[PDB]
Design an enzyme around this catalytic site. Structure first.
Site, PDB file in Angstrom:
ATOM      1  N   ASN A  37       7.348  -9.988   3.734  1.00 52.99           N
ATOM      2  CA  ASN A  37       8.066  -9.841   4.959  1.00 52.99           C
ATOM      3  C   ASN A  37       7.152  -9.851   6.181  1.00 52.99           C
ATOM      4  O   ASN A  37       6.115  -9.150   6.138  1.00 52.99           O
ATOM      5  CB  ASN A  37       8.876  -8.532   4.932  1.00 52.99           C
ATOM      6  CG  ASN A  37       9.920  -8.484   6.016  1.00 52.99           C
ATOM      7  OD1 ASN A  37      10.591  -9.460   6.339  1.00 52.99           O
ATOM      8  ND2 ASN A  37      10.104  -7.269   6.537  1.00 52.99           N
ATOM      9  N   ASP A 107       2.206  -8.204   0.024  1.00 56.17           N
ATOM     10  CA  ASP A 107       3.409  -7.472   0.574  1.00 56.17           C
ATOM     11  C   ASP A 107       4.522  -7.541  -0.449  1.00 56.17           C
ATOM     12  O   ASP A 107       4.333  -7.300  -1.640  1.00 56.17           O
ATOM     13  CB  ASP A 107       3.747  -8.112   1.891  1.00 56.17           C
ATOM     14  CG  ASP A 107       4.818  -7.674   2.847  1.00 56.17           C
ATOM     15  OD1 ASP A 107       4.423  -7.213   3.926  1.00 56.17           O
ATOM     16  OD2 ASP A 107       6.029  -7.828   2.538  1.00 56.17           O
ATOM     17  N   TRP A 108       5.763  -7.867  -0.071  1.00 57.27           N
ATOM     18  CA  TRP A 108       6.850  -8.009  -1.046  1.00 57.27           C
ATOM     19  C   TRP A 108       6.613  -9.147  -2.043  1.00 57.27           C
ATOM     20  O   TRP A 108       7.193  -9.150  -3.135  1.00 57.27           O
ATOM     21  CB  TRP A 108       8.189  -8.231  -0.313  1.00 57.27           C
ATOM     22  CG  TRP A 108       8.645  -6.913   0.263  1.00 57.27           C
ATOM     23  CD1 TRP A 108       8.655  -6.490   1.533  1.00 57.27           C
ATOM     24  CD2 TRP A 108       9.073  -5.829  -0.553  1.00 57.27           C
ATOM     25  NE1 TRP A 108       9.135  -5.193   1.595  1.00 57.27           N
ATOM     26  CE2 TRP A 108       9.400  -4.749   0.327  1.00 57.27           C
ATOM     27  CE3 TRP A 108       9.262  -5.663  -1.914  1.00 57.27           C
ATOM     28  CZ2 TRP A 108       9.878  -3.553  -0.154  1.00 57.27           C
ATOM     29  CZ3 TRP A 108       9.736  -4.460  -2.418  1.00 57.27           C
ATOM     30  CH2 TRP A 108      10.032  -3.429  -1.516  1.00 57.27           C
ATOM     31  N   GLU A 131      -3.075  -6.367   0.209  1.00 58.54           N
ATOM     32  CA  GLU A 131      -2.119  -5.707   1.069  1.00 58.54           C
ATOM     33  C   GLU A 131      -0.752  -5.683   0.398  1.00 58.54           C
ATOM     34  O   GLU A 131       0.276  -6.120   0.906  1.00 58.54           O
ATOM     35  CB  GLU A 131      -2.158  -6.281   2.460  1.00 58.54           C
ATOM     36  CG  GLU A 131      -3.267  -5.671   3.294  1.00 58.54           C
ATOM     37  CD  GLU A 131      -2.966  -4.250   3.602  1.00 58.54           C
ATOM     38  OE1 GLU A 131      -1.853  -3.942   4.126  1.00 58.54           O
ATOM     39  OE2 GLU A 131      -3.856  -3.371   3.350  1.00 58.54           O
ATOM     40  N   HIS A 271      -2.750  -5.892   8.110  1.00 61.99           N
ATOM     41  CA  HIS A 271      -1.808  -6.213   7.060  1.00 61.99           C
ATOM     42  C   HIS A 271      -1.726  -7.703   6.757  1.00 61.99           C
ATOM     43  O   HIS A 271      -1.834  -8.091   5.586  1.00 61.99           O
ATOM     44  CB  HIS A 271      -0.398  -5.652   7.339  1.00 61.99           C
ATOM     45  CG  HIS A 271       0.529  -5.889   6.157  1.00 61.99           C
ATOM     46  ND1 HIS A 271       0.327  -5.381   4.924  1.00 61.99           N
ATOM     47  CD2 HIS A 271       1.661  -6.653   6.087  1.00 61.99           C
ATOM     48  CE1 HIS A 271       1.296  -5.809   4.138  1.00 61.99           C
ATOM     49  NE2 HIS A 271       2.131  -6.572   4.791  1.00 61.99           N
TER      50      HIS A 271
HETATM   51 CL   LIG Z   1       8.862  -4.603   4.817  1.00 60.26          CL
END
Ligand SMILES: [Cl-]
Ligand SMILES: [Cl-]
Ligand SMILES: [Mg+2]
Ligand SMILES: [Mg+2]
Ligand SMILES: [Mg+2]
Length: 297
Positions: A37, A107-108, A131, A271
């Site tokens: 995301n 991330d996701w 990350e 990030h």
């Molecule tokens: Cl998120």
């Protein structure tokens, strides 16, 4: 290099009624790059070139993101983790990946890829991560600077913040990249989310799925399972650490450092570290893959 151009043109597969988009270049066993995301395959454009000739270089756009179609109907129940997994599992099956996949995740994309790996362990040759959502966390483990804003996303404030004002794209993303982005870069990230309303729902549903303080319980359970598996898996791993980093810091980073058969590098970034240190990231991934796929040139 750094650079705003995309890595290739999008290809399209029909999944469950919806066209899903993905970058696909080169030949050989897959090296599968998965964004989270509020990004898309674009996140990897300056990293994938480092793997030229090492495999079939694939980067999928999650449903409702990038150039993948939007779901309709949409609302607060749409674009949860399980639904993204349903679509992504199907796309990955459709792509005919075989059994020597190198996953490269953020991330996701890491939550999705780690779970897929747990469920398909014989098909995963190596895992490079950065990350990542490597385990369930507490609010104390979340970066302090965006803590209040992420509790607001998770509250009923989120619809205004995201669907109307597009905060995730317009504020969180550039705020977690050290360098300033060009217009063209920012345009590529804005593109899927230009329209107010449910077009932006993926960027709001995602922070509502982060496993924090036991909530939502269904995603906490999934992450507990892949955390337990990764910590004893013999699959080769590459941990691309970041300084200052954001999510994979503190207790989470300590946990990741216990994982077996793992290499590590540290790059500069918060990030969305792909935007700060692409060449360092790419070079590390390429070295990892060369080890996993000895060519004996
Ligand atoms: Cl998120
Ligand atoms: Cl819950
Ligand atoms: Mg053409
Ligand atoms: Mg269609
Ligand atoms: Mg108000």
């Amino acid at each position: 290099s750094l650079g705003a151009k995309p890595f290739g043109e999008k290809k399209f597969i029909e999944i469950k009624g919806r066209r899903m988009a993905y970058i696909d270049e080169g030949t050989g066993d897959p090296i599968l790059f998965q964004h989270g995301n509020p990004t898309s395959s674009y996140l990897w454009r300056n990293i994938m070139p480092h793997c030229a000739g090492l495999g079939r270089l694939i980067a999928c756009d999650l449903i409702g993101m990038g150039d993948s179609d939007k779901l309709d109907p949409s609302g607060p129940e749409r674009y949860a983790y399980a639904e993204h997994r349903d679509y992504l599992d199907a796309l990955w099956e459709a792509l005919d990946l075989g059994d020597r996949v190198v996953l490269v995740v953020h991330d996701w994309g890491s939550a999705l890829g780690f779970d897929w790996a747990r469920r398909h362990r014989e098909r995963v040759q190596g895992i490079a991560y950065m990350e990542a959502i490597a385990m369930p966390i507490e609010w104390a483990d979340f970066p302090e600077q965006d803590r209040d804003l992420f509790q607001a996303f998770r509250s009923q404030a989120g619809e205004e913040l995201v669907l109307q004002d597009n905060v995730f794209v317009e504020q969180v993303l550039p705020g977690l990249i050290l360098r300033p982005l060009s217009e063209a870069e920012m345009a590529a990230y804005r593109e899927p989310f230009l329209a107010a309303g449910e077009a932006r729902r993926p960027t709001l549903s995602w922070p509502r799925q982060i496993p924090i303080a036991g909530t939502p319980a269904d995603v906490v359970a999934i992450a507990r399972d892949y955390a337990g598996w990764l910590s004893e898996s013999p699959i080769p791993k590459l941990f691309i650490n970041a300084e200052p980093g954001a999510l994979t810091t503190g207790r989470m980073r300590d946990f990741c450092r216990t994982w077996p058969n793992q290499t590590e590098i540290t790059v500069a970034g918060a990030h969305f570290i792909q935007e700060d240190s692409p060449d360092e990231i790419g070079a590390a991934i390429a070295a990892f893959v060369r080890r996993l796929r000895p060519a004996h040139h």
